[PDB]
Design a protein around this ligand. Structure first.
Ligand SMILES: *[C@@H]1O[C@H](CO)[C@@H](O)[C@H](O)[C@H]1NC(C)=O
Lengths: 49, 43
């Protein structure tokens, strides 16, 4: 067993609009920092369901 | 035309001092530091 970072993040506004008009979120966070965009997925290698 | 019980009194509060008692808390603390190694300067 090793570490466990956990960070709390605001969704993007397009997603806010999705959330509260469909009762569902996308299984991916994406934020750009410096140059490139970074991205996380729910279970590994998942799609954007 | 011309023209009062006596006694002893003890007063009591409602009491507000909340009840204290000690509690044992068992827990473990795992800490993970991480480092790099080049020449003699550990990052
Ligand atoms: C997931 O889908 C939304 C809309 O379908 C899109 O805006 C978002 O960029 C996608 N995320 C990816 C592909 O990582």
């Amino acid at each position: 067993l090793l570490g466990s970072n956990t960070e709390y993040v605001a969704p993007p506004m397009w997603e806010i609009h999705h959330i509260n008009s469909h009762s569902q979120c996308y299984s991916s966070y994406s934020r750009v920092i410096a140059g490139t965009v970074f991205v996380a997925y729910h279970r590994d290698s998942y799609e954007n369901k | 035309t011309s023209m009062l019980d006596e006694g002893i009194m003890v007063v009591y509060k409602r009491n507000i001092v909340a009840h204290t008692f000690k509690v044992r808390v068992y827990q473990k603390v795992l800490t993970f530091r991480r480092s790099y190694a080049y020449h003699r300067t550990t990052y």
